[model samples]
Target: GNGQGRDWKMAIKRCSNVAVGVGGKSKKFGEGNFRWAIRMANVSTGREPGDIPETLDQLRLVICDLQERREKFGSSKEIDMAIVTLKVFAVAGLLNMTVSTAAAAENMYSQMGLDTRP
Candidate 1:
């Protein structure tokens, strides 16, 4: 037998469609995100899915207000990634609401005198 423990990938797919701690949009959670959520949630430790958002949002607030409160976040790779996500998803454009809205994203950046290099 292999020492990597039992292969649970297939078992995961057979288990459930929706993850444990889902938001308003539950069905959209895929395997990658589902497992990802479980890791963050740590259900075994009594952590729930909603807790995942709490941490993520805390990081988001830091990002959304990054321009105004730069020193608070202290500057790091995690903070940088969070900032990019906030700018790309919330400030820049919508993924499903309007496809290929690069024009809109660019408009917002230009209005704020920001460069959309990334």
Candidate 2:
């Protein structure tokens, strides 16, 4: 899958923003202070609120999936950006992490060889 298959930038931007609708209320995910705008744009949580991921790991999954669902457009760079987005959230304390979420993020990062800290 190439980055052109989907707009990873938009997905990252929307998730980084506080627009995830849940339980009849639209609320922000994360701590709401990510550097997303500097690196991404036009993010969306899908048409239905159900499409919005409710957990940190789910957020990462969607990002990684969208990164993979691309047809063209330097997908490796896109994935790098996506991973950075995840790392930023992880390091920023914005992630709403549970033990599972932590493990999930950690596993993904490990697989990708990306570290949240220098």
Candidate 3:
């Protein structure tokens, strides 16, 4: 198995699509905010299917960026779902990191006025 695990990859892809409002029958979030997230991850913008944070480190950074710019993304189910997907990846031991990462995500959730349960 890949050292990073396949679940992480799939989750990131799914979250990326959600961020960009791709799979929904109608758009949920703005594509520009998704691009802003990609930029916050410090990734190049020319990637096919849209630039997204692939690694855990990059994803965390993107989350932090969102926390700082919460007003831009606003509080919505779409953004919350995207953050939830990323939080699951961090808290599920998929990245082999300490619980501190989960705490960080929880902090982001709190600042975003989201329910921090589970």
lDDT scores in order: 0.34, 0.38, 0.43
> In candidate 1, what are the lDDT values of residues 27-107, reduced to their tens digit?
422345434433432332344444333233433343334534334537554443334333333331221222123234324
Against the true structure, candidate 3 reaches a TM-score of: 0.37
Clash list (residue pairs), candidate 1: none
Error of 1 at 110 (Å): 8.2
- Residue lDDT tens for model 3, 37-97: 3343333212344433356555555555544445475876645544544453443323433
Best by lDDT: 3
Off by over 4 Å in 2: 1-54, 75-79, 91-118
Winner on lDDT (1 vs 3): 3
